[PDB]
A paper describes a structure:
Tyrosinases (EC.1.14.18.1) are bifunctional metalloenzymes catalyzing two sequential enzymatic reactions: hydroxylation of monophenols to o-diphenols (monophenolase activity) and oxidation of o-diphenols to the corresponding o-quinones (diphenolase or catecholase activity). The tyrosinase from the bacterium [name] (vsTyr) is produced as a pre-pro-enzyme in which a C-terminal extension serves as an inactivation domain. To gain an understanding of the catalytic machinery and regulation of vsTyr activity, we determined the structure of the catalytically active “core domain” of vsTyr by X-ray crystallography.
Crystals of the vsTyr core domain belong to the space group C2 containing two monomers per asymmetric unit. Despite reconstitution with CuSO4 after its purification, the initial crystal structure, determined by molecular replacement at 1.43 Å resolution, revealed that the copper sites were only partially occupied. A second dataset was therefore collected from a vsTyr crystal soaked with CuSO4 for 15 min (1.64 Å), resulting in considerably improved metal site occupancy. The vsTyr structure, determined from a crystal presoaked with CuSO4 for 15 min, revealed significantly increased metal site occupancies of 70–85% for site A and >90% for site B, respectively. For vsTyr, the distances of 3.7 Å and 4.0 Å observed in the structures determined from unsoaked and CuSO4-presoaked crystals, respectively, fall within the 3.2–4.0 Å range that is characteristic for the met form. These additional binding sites are most likely not of any physiological relevance, since their affinities for Cu2+ are expected to be low, and none of them has to date been observed in homologous enzymes. Interestingly, the increased metal site occupancy is the only noticeable difference between the two vsTyr core domain structures reported here. Their superposition results in a very low RMSD of 0.4 Å and identical crystal packing, hinting at the remarkable structural stability of the vsTyr core domain. The final models contain all amino acids of the crystallized construct, except for the C-terminal two (unsoaked) and three amino acids (soaked) in chains B, respectively.
Author numbering: 34 to 357
Write the structure that this text describes.
């Protein structure tokens, strides 16, 4: 658990400068040309293109994506100590009041206001990106049902995934609280249920052949993760969710709950990952779309590279977890 960087509770007074650094980076990334892969919308589209939902690649893909984006925020904030604070929704079952301030709020006029402007600004860059894809990357797009960039845009338009100014979230500063179901989903009882499994698949959601396929889900994915996404509403209810800065605070917390689970398993001398023939099936899954803090494609392009915190070199201030 020794590490250079420290993911703190966003309610920790020592986290406050990191939330100001996050606002500085968001402003930079909204101002970068969408030819730069660290542009705010370019970053969100990595999620649309490659995120697994409803399978055993859930926690590990999100560990990869959050750790790379953490480096990008560190770089573009000029804050060399930056680490993503976590939203402990078990302790704070509401959108944090701090995420309604400045560019932490995706209704802020610094954000693209309309689908029309979004398409205008991102269409040529996303076509250029498509035209650059390797054989391997085009196979990932085929596995996801995308034959061209315009199939991605059809999904963006028809879902819909983009929300205009005033609708970027459903929850508001005045009424930021979760509904009864989502309050239960983030309750200490449900979190303890989420941590109880003693094998990776039951913890982290069901095995599939490729990470664009849907399977049975674990508690961590199906209850606190999914219910929080949908109760926030707007961007957070669909696959351009990382448009909302709170996405990374939500995922800092999910990743903390994984760290809690791994340490619980280690204490009991039980496996922390899939075992036997399942281990290479899981570890060898291609993750081909991550962007480093220099805006270049990353070398670490398989799920197994992200099994541990590893090179990302962060630890957690302890939060809501198992009964001691
Ligand atoms: Cu330190
Ligand atoms: Cu996701
Ligand atoms: Cu630098
Ligand atoms: Cu620099
Ligand atoms: Cu999520």
């Amino acid at each position: 658990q020794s590490a250079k960087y420290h993911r703190l509770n966003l309610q920790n007074p020592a986290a406050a400068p990191f939330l100001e650094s996050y606002k500085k980076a968001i402003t930079v990334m909204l101002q970068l040309p969408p030819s730069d892969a660290r542009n705010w919308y370019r970053n969100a589209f990595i999620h649309t293109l490659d995120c697994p939902h409803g399978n055993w690649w859930f926690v590990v893909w999100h560990r990869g994506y959050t750790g790379w984006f953490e480096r990008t925020v560190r770089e573009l904030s000029g804050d060399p100590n930056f680490a993503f604070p976590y939203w402990d929704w078990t302790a704070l079952p509401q959108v944090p009041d701090s995420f309604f301030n400045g560019v932490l709020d995706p209704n802020n006029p610094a954000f693209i206001a309309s689908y029309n402007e979004f398409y205008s600004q991102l269409s040529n860059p996303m076509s250029a990106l498509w035209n650059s894809f390797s054989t391997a990357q085009l196979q990932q797009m085929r596995n996801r049902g995308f034959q061209s960039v315009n199939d991605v845009w059809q999904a963006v338009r028809d879902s819909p995934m983009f929300f205009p100014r005033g609708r970027a979230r459903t929850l508001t500063r005045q009424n930021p609280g979760f509904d009864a179901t989502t309050r239960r989903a983030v309750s200490i009882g449900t979190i303890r249920n989420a941590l109880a499994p003693t094998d990776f698949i039951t913890f982290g959601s069901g095995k599939t052949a490729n990470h664009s396929e849907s399977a049975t889900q674990g508690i961590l994915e199906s209850q606190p993760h999914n219910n929080v996404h949908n109760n926030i509403g707007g961007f957070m209810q669909d696959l351009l969710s990382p448009t909302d800065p709170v996405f990374f605070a939500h995922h800092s917390n999910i990743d903390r709950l994984w760290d809690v689970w791994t340490r619980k398993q280690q204490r009991l001398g039980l496996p922390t990952l899939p075992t036997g023939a399942n281990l290479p099936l899981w570890a060898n899954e291609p993750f081909l779309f991550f962007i480093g803090p220099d805006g270049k494609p990353v070398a670490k392009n398989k799920a197994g590279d992200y099994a541990t915190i590893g090179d990302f070199d962060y630890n957690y201030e302890p939060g809501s977890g198992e009964a001691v």
